[PDB]
Amino acid sequence: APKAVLVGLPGSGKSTIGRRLAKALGVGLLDTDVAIEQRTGRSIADIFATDGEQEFRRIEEDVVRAALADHDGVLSLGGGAVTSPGVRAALAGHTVVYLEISAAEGVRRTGGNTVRPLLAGPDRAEKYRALMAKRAPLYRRVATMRVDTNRRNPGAVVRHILSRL
Ligand SMILES: Nc1ncnc2c1ncn2[C@@H]1O[C@H](COP(=O)(O)OP(=O)(O)NP(=O)(O)O)[C@@H](O)[C@H]1O
Ligand SMILES: O=C(O)C1=C[C@@H](O)[C@H](O)[C@H](O)C1
């Protein structure tokens, strides 16, 4: 079973905080978005364009159930994984950390285009605020620890978590 599992919106810090926490405990990192590209032929934007979001979600669920059984290090999840009811039932019993961020700082952190099919195009600030309103009740229901990332630098986030494990 993992030592910790990380969830939240794009730009909260899931990949950055996960690398740094794994180095301090002595263990490996597994990132489910990276695992998906390795197993199929292609990119995340390629699968969304040829096949659709509902077929992305079925591949993501099967990857997640297997990681929770076989991996003893730190695990980082994709941003919309909590919208599947089969993902929420596999998480019950596990150690789960929710990273919180405001809408104005969150949109400024995503600013140098990694891509992101669901944030693409004009009116970026309007689309980010609509994603927050519908997911926030879902992050609160799955969590066992909540941490505020608004005025904490990344080394100080790591130390707050380490003392509560
Ligand atoms: N506490 C922090 N303070 C200052 N900058 C930060 C903080 N956390 C993350 N960043 C920066 O914000 C950017 C995004 O962080 P990242 O770790 O990629 O988040 P993400 O939650 O994994 N995205 P996704 O899987 O696509 O939903 C990076 O350049 C980081 O360097
Ligand atoms: O639905 C989402 O919010 C996301 C889906 C994919 O682009 C990626 O899995 C990303 O982390 C965000």
| Proximal ligand: closest to the CA of 6 | 1
Ligand 2 touching residue 44 (CB < 6 A): yes
Q: Give the technique used to solve this structure.
A: X-ray
**Would the annotation count 57 as a binding residue?**
yes
Q: Which domain holds residue 146?
A: 1-165
| Proximal ligand: closest to the CA of 135 | 2
Got the DSSP string for 43-61? -HHHHHHHH-HHHHHHHHH
Ligand 1 touching residue 106 (CB < 6 A): no
Ligand 1 touching residue 160 (CB < 6 A): no
**φ/ψ (deg, to 5) at 54:** -65, -30
User: Which residues lie across from 29 on neighbouring strands?
Assistant: 74
What is the token pair recorded at 104? 């104005």
**What are the residue ranges of helices labelled H in 53-153?**
53-70, 85-91, 103-109, 124-142
How far apart are alpha carbons 45 and 100 in whole angstroms? 26
- 158 Cβ neighbours under 8 A, 6+ residues apart: 17, 20, 21, 24
Ligand 1 touching residue 135 (CB < 6 A): no
Total tally of structural domains belonging to the chain? 1
Residue carrying structure tokens 């730190």:
74
Ligand 1 touching residue 16 (CB < 6 A): yes
- Name the DSSP letter for residue 81: G
164 contacts 145 by C-beta, under 8 angstroms: yes
Picking from 163, 156, 160, 158, the residue whose alpha carbon sits closest to that of residue 74 is 158
Please, what's the largest Cα pairwise distance for the chain?
45
**Would the annotation count 93 as a binding residue?**
no
For the beta sheet containing 96-100, the strands, ordered from the edge strand earlier in sequence to the opposite edge, are: 29-31, 74-76, 4-7, 96-100, 145-148
H/E run at residue 97? strand 96-100
Other beta carbons less than 10 A from residue 97's beta carbon: 24
CATH number of the domain at 159, please: 3.40.50.300
4 contacts 19 by C-beta, under 8 angstroms: no
* Residue nearest atom 27 in ligand 1 by C-alpha distance: 10
- Of the chain, the end-to-end C-alpha distance in Å amounts to 14
Q: Label residue 40 exposed, middle or buried (CB < 10 Å: 0-12, 13-18, 19+).
A: exposed
What is the token pair recorded at 45? 């934007």
CA of 79 to the centre of ligand 2 (A): 5
| Proximal ligand: closest to the CA of 100 | 1
**Would the annotation count 152 as a binding residue?**
yes
**φ/ψ (deg, to 5) at 146:** -115, 130
**Would the annotation count 148 as a binding residue?**
no
How far apart are alpha carbons 78 and 102 in whole angstroms? 19
